Amino acid sequence: TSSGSEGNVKLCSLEEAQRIWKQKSAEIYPIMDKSSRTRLALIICNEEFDSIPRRTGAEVDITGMTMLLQNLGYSVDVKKNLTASDMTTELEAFAHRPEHKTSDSTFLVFMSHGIREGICGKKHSEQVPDILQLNAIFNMLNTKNCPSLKDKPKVIIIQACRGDSPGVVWFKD
């Protein structure tokens, strides 16, 4: 039933779970006790911008990803319409959350306009770029800057253009 905490996410049965622990021995990330764990996730979505077109439909993305991450056991912080500077501040704050110490993993989701260089902040324009680089995201969440997530999977999801090209070539059929 979709009325449960896991919503539309299909459940892993105990039979499935023990088979998974058989197919792969000591090569699975450990999960913490459901009763005591404090999993966190972060969603940064830029929909309304100063200079670039509004991202109509972004609310559908926020709703879908928020509910999915909750279904998977994560407490989700949603931040909207941030400059690259604000994104950096929010990511640093996220890295400092005490809940990560009693968590086994994290998800970070970024949704915005993008260019080859990276992800657009709310103030971005061609004349005055406002860009967050993927490299900065990794640096803020690594073992130096986020020791609480040492040895724990950190999944980064990015919805953004990476350039202007349609991404296709023709071939004779």
Binding site: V60, D61, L68, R162, P166, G167
Partner: protein, 88 residues
């Protein structure tokens, strides 16, 4: 006593398209990558690790239409399989 740890480890990034290329967003249905990711996570979190799920998402994009994109996994330092074990 102090011990050394790798500075960067246990990351996986998943981007909506390949470098240089666009990603698509439907004004009422939302971003195609995001929708597809949710559908695959819902279906496969129970049986597949995250790397495998991301592969399946990529496969679903394989036959391009007028609005093409190919999601890309980037900068992967997962040393183990990441199963979500939904319900646990």
């Amino acid at each position: 006593a102090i011990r050394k740890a790798h500075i960067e480890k246990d990351f996986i990034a998943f981007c909506s398209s390949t470098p240089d290329n666009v990603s698509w967003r439907h004004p009422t249905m939302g971003s195609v990558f995001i929708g597809r990711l949710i559908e695959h996570m819902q279906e496969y979190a129970c049986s597949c690790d995250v790397e495998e799920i991301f592969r399946k998402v990529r496969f679903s994009f394989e036959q391009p239409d007028g609005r093409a994109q190919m999601p890309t996994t980037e900068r992967v330092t997962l040393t183990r399989c990441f199963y979500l074990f939904p319900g646990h």
